[PDB]
Design a protein around this ligand. Sequence first.
Ligand SMILES: C[S@@+](CC[C@H](N)C(=O)[O-])C[C@H]1O[C@@H](n2cnc3c(N)ncnc32)[C@H](O)[C@@H]1O
Length: 328
Amino acid sequence: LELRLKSPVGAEPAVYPWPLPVYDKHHDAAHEIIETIRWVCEEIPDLKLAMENYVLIDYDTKSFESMQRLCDKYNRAIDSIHQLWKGTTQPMKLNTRPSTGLLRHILQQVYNHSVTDPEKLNNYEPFSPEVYGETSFDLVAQMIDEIKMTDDDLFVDLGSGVGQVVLQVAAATNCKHHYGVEKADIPAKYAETMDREFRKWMKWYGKKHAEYTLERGDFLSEEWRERIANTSVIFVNNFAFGPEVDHQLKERFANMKEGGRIVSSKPFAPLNFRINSRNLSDIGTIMRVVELSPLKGSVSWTGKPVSYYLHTIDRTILENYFSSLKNP
Ligand SMILES: C[S@@+](CC[C@H](N)C(=O)[O-])C[C@H]1O[C@@H](n2cnc3c(N)ncnc32)[C@H](O)[C@@H]1O
């Protein structure tokens, strides 16, 4: 026994066994199905136009028949749309990026099909750099909107977890490459499935994504010293990293090129940094730091609004200090 949803672009249908599984207290396969149909409707006007017909909510996530009736109405509409494209009508553009709303849904779907046992992610040594925590879709969305990127950029998420930040960025921008490196076995293992599921579902919806790679590794290693040096945009959720690891990261950001940028949950240099005779060796001498605007309604455990910081490699700061010394 099952449930099938045909792809709007001919990819292999999505098959859900019955009974539909539950992902967590607020997410189950039944709702995923309904939302997926809703979103494909957003991709295809004619499809949405056909789904209005009679579907007066007469479906209940409990009954197989009731769900099978929903899927079938969706599937029959997809067949007609497919015939419609054989006619004169223009077939949906295949190399487009997903809208933000579809992307949120897609990542939710990929996650649920990938992180089967969410609890396992918390099995980490507390009070260590291994502490797990996920950056909200919204913040990543904010970063993407504020930190403009181009096909010239190289994006890296240091300590990528199951890799959902990399996936969102790869789906939203056109960097030459996106990388995620994660050290712990658990999140890294899940990342392999996140990766497969993601590519599979993007194909299913007919949406394009930039190049990306999810890697198992240690970003403090020798290999990464240079890779970091060549990265133009680094995202790093270092809230629980600690002074030791942050110090080491600073030692590595010191080799980045001008205009290179770093977005993190904990600043690598004071915001009020004033270069003087005692702090010449400080990383703050070669970078501008600013606090990104907080997203309205966003309370972290600290009770205050969640905060992220943008650092921009700017050696002009240092150059001017020395000039100021040739005077005054
Ligand atoms: C807060 S989690 C990241 C969650 C995901 N990056 C996000 O933004 O939602 C931080 C990750 O850093 C990783 N990490 C810590 N030290 C690392 C190292 N030296 N090399 C690679 N990953 C490391 C951990 O294993 C942990 O999963």
